Amino acid sequence: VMTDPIADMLTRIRNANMVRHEKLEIPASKLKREIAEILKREGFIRDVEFVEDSKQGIIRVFLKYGQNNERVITGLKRISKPGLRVYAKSNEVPRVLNGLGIAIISTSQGVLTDKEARAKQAGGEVLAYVW
Template structure:
C-alpha cells in the first residue's frame, strides 16, 4: 500500500487509537516517524515506544498515555506542512501552539525537534505538525 503522506498517516493512526481508547497503536516505521515518536515521549504525550519487526516490515509500537478517568493526554494533532503545500518558518517566526501549552514539531537542518528546541538553537525549518 502506497501512502502519500506518511506523517499524516501516523498522526491519524494515533488520533483514531486515542478516540477508540486503545492502549497502543502500530505505525509503519521510518526515521522521521521514530524522531516524532521520540519527541512525543520526551514531551510526555506517550508512555513509550519501541521498534518491532514483522518479517521484512518494521513498525513503531506506541504505548498511548491517558490521564485519570481515561482522559486523553493528547487532545489534538494537526498536520501543517503537507506534500502539496510545504510550510516553512524562519527562526523568528516559529509558531507557538496554544501560547506554549502545545508543541510544534519542526524539521530543521539539525534534525527534527520541537519549536522550543529550535528557538534555543536559533534555527527555522519546515513545520511538520502541531500537538496539544
C-alpha cells in the first residue's frame, strides 16, 4: 500500500536521525536519487550511493555528524501530500528558517532547491522542507 514513498523516505531519514543511526536503505526511485543528491549537495547528509538489484534498486545514505553529538538534519516535513496538493508561484516561493533551512520543489525543469528555484524564477510542486 504505503501511498507515497516520499513520506517513507523523509520519515526513514527522520527516524534514523532521531535514533542517531549511521546509514539507511531506501527503495530508490529516481525521485529518491534526486532528493538524496540535493541533500548531498546541501550537506545535510554525508554520503549517498545506490546499489542496483532486480528488486527495485536500493539506495543507501550515510548520515552526517561533524562534532561527536549533534543532529545536523534537524527535521523533515512533507507538504505536498496526496489528497491535498500544494503549489507555489515564482514570488511566494517559501523560505523556511530564512537563509537556514531548505525546501525541495520540483519545478517544470528538474527538481530544485528553493534558492536556485528563486534564481530561476520558476515554481512547481513544493514537496519537502528540511528544517
